[PDB]
Amino acid sequence: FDNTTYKNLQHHDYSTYTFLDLNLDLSKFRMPQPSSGRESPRH
Amino acid sequence: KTSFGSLKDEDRIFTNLYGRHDWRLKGAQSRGDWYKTKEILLKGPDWILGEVKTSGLRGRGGAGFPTGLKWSFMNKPSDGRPKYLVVNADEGEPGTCKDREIIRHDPHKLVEGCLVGGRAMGARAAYIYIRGEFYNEASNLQVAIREAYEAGLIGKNACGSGYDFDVFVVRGAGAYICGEETALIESIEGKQGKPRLKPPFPADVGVFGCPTTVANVETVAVSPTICRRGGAWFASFGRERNSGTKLFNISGHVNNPCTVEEEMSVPLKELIEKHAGGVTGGWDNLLAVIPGGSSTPLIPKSVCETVLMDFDALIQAQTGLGTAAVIVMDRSTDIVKAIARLIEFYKHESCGQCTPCREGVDWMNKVMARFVRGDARPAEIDSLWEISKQIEGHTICALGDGAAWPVQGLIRHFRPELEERMQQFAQQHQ
Amino acid sequence: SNLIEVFVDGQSVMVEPGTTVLQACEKVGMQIPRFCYHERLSVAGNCRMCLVEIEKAPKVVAACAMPVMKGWNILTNSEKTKKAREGVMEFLLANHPLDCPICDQGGECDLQDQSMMFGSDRSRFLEGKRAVEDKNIGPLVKTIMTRCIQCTRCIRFASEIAGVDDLGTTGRGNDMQVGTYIEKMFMSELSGNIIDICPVGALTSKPYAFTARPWETRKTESIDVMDAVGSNIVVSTRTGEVMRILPRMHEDINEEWISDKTR
Amino acid sequence: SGVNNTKKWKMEFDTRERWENPLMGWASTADPLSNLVLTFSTKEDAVAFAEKNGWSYDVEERKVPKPKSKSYGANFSWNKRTRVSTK
Amino acid sequence: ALFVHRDTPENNPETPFDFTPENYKRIEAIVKNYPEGHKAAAVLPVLDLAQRQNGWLPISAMNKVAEILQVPPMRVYEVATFYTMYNRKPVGKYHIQVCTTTPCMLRNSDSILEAIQKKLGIKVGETTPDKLFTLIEVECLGACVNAPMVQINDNYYEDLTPKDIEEIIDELKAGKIPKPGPRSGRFSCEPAGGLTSLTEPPKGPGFGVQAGL
Ligand SMILES: Cc1cc2nc3c(=O)[nH]c(=O)nc-3n(C[C@H](O)[C@H](O)[C@H](O)COP(=O)(O)O)c2cc1C
Ligand code: SF4
Ligand code: SF4
Ligand code: SF4
Ligand code: FES
Ligand code: FES
Ligand SMILES: [K+]
């Protein structure tokens, strides 16, 4: 049990694309999206 | 009980508030996160909402509506549309930084809360809207969400309960107004963050035009503990209808500005002295406090002596708990300038949609700039009071009310200061 | 059988579900003041000129958007309603330019007329006024956008009626501006109709500029011959000369629009 | 948008020649009824007045705007084209 | 500072821009996060991705985003001009953003702003001639208890003093990267001089759990 150190030092190596790379890796875990039935409100 | 405070560390919900333990899944699990989530999920929405209602929890985003009743607007049969939970992580109120610590140090509490809170409403997914300036915190949350997906805790058959749930994270682009619940929805839909009129209500027509519930990060993150430990445990802290613990941000002229979890209804003086190390220069040096983020009116030293930090106590003092961000100002502060800077903030944040705030807040900003220099007449103080009353209650969202209330608190408690500022200016230019 | 009962200043009226507070008032001959609302456009609810007191409710509601609940008593002439109108009109005029003598909308301006009938009779605005640069959107519609009150009628008309999504708002807050952002013409066979629906002199007829005043024109109700639709029109004349062509409302033909060729 | 000038019935006569005064270019007329406009509470009152005075008349039925269906929530439709793209 | 676009030789519809193949795969992931038939919801993330690739958003960048998502170009112009994190003009390699809202101002954010300008010899809203630094004042950045603070690009530097901020700028000039976070001596938001809470080790799984689960 150590209470005298900061254990959130990972975010010092995050870069420009870190967030959108993780979102790209999560894409395989997602469920199929619902559909409104048309390509868009202008269709 | 008649006195509140001194929350034992074993009764704190955000036990990694300071990030001195591992924030990833292994750390989270060791602290009790994700424990028996399957059993909670199989209890059913009615049981989950029962626990939240009995806990007496109230929304931590600033408005404080009873969470259990609010989440029950979703407990109704699907009409063919998907149902969504939107987690307000915009964290924009000046003085407020509580949601930042939850997101980056206890992300698995938020994720589990989304699942538990999403199950109670019957949602298929959760969108966690987070302000774009929190890039590193958003990345931490993205790492945690991947771990939850990898362990089978979210997604298909979440936790082994057979409930499918996705947790998406979407980033803002720099707008305080996007913390407003309906402007947040508009921002997710790729429009300008302009709040909607109500009705319809988000529980009927929300994100993508679908049933939606918008919940603050703190409100969602505490729900799993309330289910595990029960509403009765939560309702045992704080005054009646002011239940539970609360994250407080103490900033301004304190010795040790910090974030800390503390019982609801703890005295304001106790919170500042116990945790923040007291007012800079001692308690006698206190001028005023903004007890719940910039939108709440300030209260002077005399009121701050004995006021409790809960929803009903602070209303009694002509203010509000808000987000529980305590900004302390000592006697060296130029109180007129401090308030004038907050109006300038609301001028830069107004979405411009509706007339009273688009025009009124910029008007109040121009008047407050002259009040800082005393380049005004005393008759303008009552005019400025009336202008604020015209904005408040006549706008689409509460940002207009959040700009009128600070001005009223200044005029209410420091009118002699304003008048003496004008008298000085007149004497110099005569 | 579906109708519900509401009250407009104590007068009972029977309305269908979904009828707005503004429409209910219209059934007893009360026209609620408005700026952003147009019955042929989608509801916006931003000008806040239609705020009206509901009896026993502490907060005023935007009549143009709020559906009316059964049993509601709408107080269209109460002190709270009057003061809400005075406050909103005060904000609308705070940055409005002192342009009426040089502004073509003068004499047929909803801002002028609703200011006379519903707003206060004097100013207490002691600051300088906003000024906005003028955009160019073709040879038909002249823009003096310092007069714009940000009601978004033109934006809604272009997107929904004309089917063109080239008008929008740029910026935020007090600096929000209506326009095309880029230098772009709004050339649509229906483009001239934004002149009619703009409540102020922000969008005006370029050919008509400065030629006449509304009170001096004679109105002749006639028909259009530029196509086979038969759009109903008004021919404004003055001293034996044709000054301009306006749409005349006909629900079964042109509604309240005309083509740019007709106009 | 005001509708207060659409409450009452009017009676006017057919327009006749106006010409330019040679001296100043003003609009001259020889029609004594060029400015005559009468107001009536109902078309029946107006028809009665025109017949006792011996004028041939045309009566045009009053155009009243039909009731519309307005829904603010329609601006945010899940699957209908009524969804707006800007506010 | 202006919300109307005027074509210049450097910012016009023909100004070249296109997402790289790596960013197109990211775009396909962003869009898939929203229900079918609601692709316009990806305007903010995709527009922010264009900024990350290119540094700022020329009009041609906004035109490409509208084209990809099949939204009218004006609807992308509205988003670009509404949100303050989108750069419609080039900014320096390091976008220095100093919070000056009241909580940060009460802890002397002016001294941070004054120190930076003196160091870089510029003003608020100016870019250095070398085009390495752009300085601006921003509103509350959600890090008030760590005031005064600044954001440079994606990172927060907190608990600053005039000496600390000058150290950060020196490293940025040198080409290094300074670690984000407080510079006072605390790791995050905990009270300085010792914790007043969360000193006992946290309880394990199952602790305090009601019966019936
Ligand atoms: C201008 C403005 C900004 C707001 N910002 C936030 C915010 O950053 N976070 C938040 O939770 N609520 C914010 N709110 C309040 C939300 O609209 C809403 O009340 C809240 O998210 C509901 O969640 P809760 O019931 O759990 O508190 C804001 C409201 C306004 C008017
Ligand atoms: S009150 Fe201000 S922020 Fe809220 S909708 Fe109106 S203009 Fe926008
Ligand atoms: S729009 Fe109306 S109020 Fe404004 S200057 Fe023109 S006539 Fe006057
Ligand atoms: S130009 Fe006219 S119609 Fe368009 S928003 Fe401004 S006032 Fe309304
Ligand atoms: S007419 Fe209702 S808000 Fe404009
Ligand atoms: S006031 Fe500066 S981070 Fe909040
Ligand atoms: K007009």
DSSP per position, B101-166:
HHHHH-HHHHHHHHHHHHHHHT-SEEEEEE-TT-HHHHHHHHHHHHHHHHTTSSEEEETTTTEEEE
What region, left, alpha or beta, does residue B278 occupy, with left being phi > 0 and alpha being psi -120 to 50 degrees? left
Integer Cα distance of B308 and B268 in angstroms: 6
Which residues of chain E make contact with A43, given a CB cutoff of 8 A? 37
Using CA coordinates, name the residue in chain C closest to D27.
C239
Mark out the alpha helices in chain C (DSSP H runs).
Answer: 21-26, 79-94, 110-118, 153-160, 193-197
Experimental determination approach used: cryo-EM
With CA atoms as reference, report the closest residue to B113 among B101, B128, B100, B98: B128
- Residue of E2, E67, E70, E74 best to disrupt the C interface, most CBs of C under 10 A: E74
Phi/psi for D39 (5° steps) reads -115, 145
With CA atoms as reference, report the closest residue to B85 among B24, B17, B154: B154
Which amino acid is it at B112? E
Q: What is each CA distance from B361 to B388, B400, B404, C93, E211, in whole angstroms?
A: 8, 7, 8, 14, 53
Containing domain of residue B105, as a range?
Answer: 25-236
Phi/psi for E43 (5° steps) reads -65, -50
Chain A nearest CA to D76, separation (Å)? 10
The answer, yes or no, to whether the previous bond of B200 is cis (omega within 30 of 0) is yes
Chain E nearest CA to C124, separation (Å)? 29
Please report the resolution in angstroms: 2.4
Which residues of chain E make contact with D86, given a CB cutoff of 8 A? 74-75, 78
Contact between chains at C46 and B355 (C-beta distance less than 8 A): yes
Spatial neighbors of C85 by CB under 8 A, at least 6 apart, are C33, C49, C51, C118, C119
**Chains contacting A (3 or more CB pairs within 8 Å):** B, D, E
Q: Dihedral angle at the C-alpha atoms of E13, E15, E16, E19, nearest 10 degrees?
A: -60
Q: Is B195 marked within a binding site?
A: yes
Integer Cα distance of D23 and D3 in angstroms: 41
Spatial neighbors of B169 by CB under 8 A, at least 6 apart, are A19, A23, B127, B128, B130, B138, B141, B142, B145
- Residue E130 half-sphere exposure toward CB, CA atoms < 13 A: 7
Most distant pair of Cα atoms in chain B: their distance: 80
**∠ CA B298-B299-B303 to the nearest 5 degrees?**
170
* Ligand 6 neighbours by CB, cut-off 6 Å: B 94; E 99, 101, 103-104, 140-144, 147, 149
* Ligand 3 neighbours by CB, cut-off 6 Å: C 96, 99-100, 103, 105-106, 109, 111-112, 147, 200-201
Integer Cα distance of B361 and B177 in angstroms: 14
Instruction: Give the closest of B191, B196, B210 to D78, CB-based.
Output: B210
CB neighbours (10 Å) of residue E59?
24
DSSP line for B364-427: HHHHHHHHHHT-S-THHHHHHHHHHHHHTTSSSSTHHHHHHHHHHHHHHHHHHHHHHHHHHHHH
Which residues of chain E make contact with A11, given a CB cutoff of 8 A? 180
Backbone breaks in chain E after residues (C–N over 2.5 Å): none
Sign of the dihedral defined by the CA atoms of residues B90, B260, B255, B405, in that order: positive
Integer Cα distance of E181 and A14 in angstroms: 14
Tokens standing for B416? Answer: 């002699």
Q: How far is the CA of C47 from the centre of ligand 5 (A)?
A: 5
Mark out the alpha helices in B244-334 (DSSP H runs).
Answer: 268-275, 301-304, 311-316
Tokens standing for B156? Answer: 């298909």
Which DSSP state fits E11? B
Q: What is each CA distance from C19 to C58, C64, C66, C90, D74, in whole angstroms?
A: 22, 10, 9, 29, 14
Q: Dihedral angle at the C-alpha atoms of C32, C34, C40, C44, nearest 10 degrees?
A: -120
Look up tokens 């929803």; give the residue.
B311
Contact between chains at D80 and A42 (C-beta distance less than 8 A): no
Pairing of the two strands B245-252 and B325-330: parallel
Mark out the alpha helices in B14-97 (DSSP H runs).
Answer: 25-30, 37-43, 45-55, 67-71
Could you tell me how far CA B207 lies from the centroid of its own chain? 21
Q: How far is the CA of B193 from the centre of ligand 2 (A)?
A: 10
Contact between chains at E37 and D79 (C-beta distance less than 8 A): yes
CB B12 within 8 A of CB B261: yes
Could you tell me how far CA B30 lies from the centroid of its own chain? 28
Q: How far is the CA of C171 from the centre of ligand 6 (A)?
A: 23
Which amino acid is it at B167? V
Which residues of chain B make contact with E147, given a CB cutoff of 8 A? 251, 257
Q: Tell me if B140 CB under 6 Å of ligand 2.
A: no
How big is chain B, counted in residues? 430
Which residues of chain B make contact with D85, given a CB cutoff of 8 A? 191
Best residue for ligand 4 mutational test, from C95, C111, C149 (most atoms within 8 Å of Cβ): C149
Contact between chains at B251 and E107 (C-beta distance less than 8 A): yes
Chain E nearest CA to D75, separation (Å)? 14
Integer Cα distance of E84 and B154 in angstroms: 34
Pairing of the two strands B125-130 and B163-171: parallel
DSSP bridge pairs for A35: E36
Most distant pair of Cα atoms in chain C: their distance: 56
Pairing of the two strands E133-138 and E94-99: parallel
Which amino acid is it at B388? S
Integer Cα distance of B396 and C59 in angstroms: 12
With CA atoms as reference, report the closest residue to C118 among C71, C48, C171: C48
Chain C nearest CA to B389, separation (Å)? 9
Integer Cα distance of B172 and E141 in angstroms: 13
Nearest ligand, measured from the Cα of C106: 3
Which residues of chain B make contact with A34, given a CB cutoff of 8 A? 81-82, 124
CB E32 within 8 A of CB B166: no
**Chains contacting E (3 or more CB pairs within 8 Å):** A, B, C, D
Q: Is B237 marked within a binding site?
A: no
CB D70 within 8 A of CB C39: yes
With CA atoms as reference, report the closest residue to B286 among B296, B297, B299: B299
Which amino acid is it at B172? G
For chains C and E, CB pairs below 8 A equal: 45
Integer Cα distance of E80 and C181 in angstroms: 11
Integer Cα distance of C48 and C84 in angstroms: 9
Pairing of the two strands B258-263 and B245-252: antiparallel
Helix (H, G, I), strand (E, B) or coil at B279: strand
Spatial neighbors of B108 by CB under 8 A, at least 6 apart, are B23, B24, B25, B28, B29, B33, B34, B144, B147, B148
CB neighbours (10 Å) of residue B252?
31
Integer Cα distance of C229 and C21 in angstroms: 35
Helix (H, G, I), strand (E, B) or coil at E174: helix
CB C71 within 8 A of CB C6: yes
Which DSSP state fits C195? H
Integer Cα distance of B186 and B208 in angstroms: 9
Helix (H, G, I), strand (E, B) or coil at C187: coil
* Ligand 4 neighbours by CB, cut-off 6 Å: C 148-154, 178, 198-200, 202-203
Best residue for ligand 1 mutational test, from B87, B198, B216, B343 (most atoms within 8 Å of Cβ): B216
Spatial neighbors of B427 by CB under 8 A, at least 6 apart, are none
Q: How far is the CA of C92 from the centre of ligand 4 (A)?
A: 13
Q: Is B99 marked within a binding site?
A: no
Look up tokens 């949609």; give the residue.
B353
Q: Dihedral angle at the C-alpha atoms of E194, E196, E197, E200, nearest 10 degrees?
A: 60
CB A22 within 8 A of CB B139: yes
Integer Cα distance of C41 and C23 in angstroms: 14
Q: How far is the CA of B403 from the centre of ligand 2 (A)?
A: 10
Helix (H, G, I), strand (E, B) or coil at E122: coil
The helix or strand, by DSSP H or E, that contains position C143, with its residue range, turns out to be strand C141-143
The helix or strand, by DSSP H or E, that contains position C236, with its residue range, turns out to be strand C232-238
The helix or strand, by DSSP H or E, that contains position B87, with its residue range, turns out to be strand B84-89
DSSP line for E15-66: S-----HHHHHHHHHHHTTS-BT-GGGGHHHHHHHHHHHHSS--HHHHHHHH
With CA atoms as reference, report the closest residue to C67 among B205, D2, D63: B205
Q: Domain holding B199: CATH number?
A: 3.40.50.11540
Mark out the alpha helices in B209-354 (DSSP H runs).
Answer: 217-221, 223-229, 231-235, 268-275, 301-304, 311-316, 335-349
Q: How far is the CA of C205 from the centre of ligand 3 (A)?
A: 15
Look up tokens 């106590």; give the residue.
B313
Helix (H, G, I), strand (E, B) or coil at B304: helix
CB neighbours (10 Å) of residue E91?
19
Integer Cα distance of B259 and B271 in angstroms: 11
Tokens standing for E105? Answer: 């101002």
Spatial neighbors of B5 by CB under 8 A, at least 6 apart, are B262, B263, B266, B267, B270, B271, B274
Sign of the dihedral defined by the CA atoms of residues B299, B300, B305, B306, in that order: negative
Contact between chains at E75 and D79 (C-beta distance less than 8 A): no
Chain E nearest CA to C166, separation (Å)? 6
DSSP bridge pairs for C73: C7
Phi/psi for C76 (5° steps) reads -80, -10
Note which residues in 64-83 of chain E have CB less than 8 A from chain D. 71-72, 74-75, 78
Query: Exposed, middle or buried: residue D17 (CB in 10 Å: 0-12, 13-18, 19+)?
Result: exposed
Q: What is each CA distance from B19 to A3, B14, B104, C144, E190, in whole angstroms?
A: 9, 10, 8, 56, 9
Residue nearest to atom 1 of ligand 2 (CA): B400
Look up tokens 């000054």; give the residue.
C243
Helix (H, G, I), strand (E, B) or coil at C7: strand
Integer Cα distance of E169 and E165 in angstroms: 6
Spatial neighbors of B274 by CB under 8 A, at least 6 apart, are B5, E196
Integer Cα distance of B171 and B219 in angstroms: 19
CB B337 within 8 A of CB B372: yes
Which DSSP state fits C114? H
Tokens standing for B340? Answer: 């004038």
Pairing of the two strands B245-252 and B212-216: unpaired
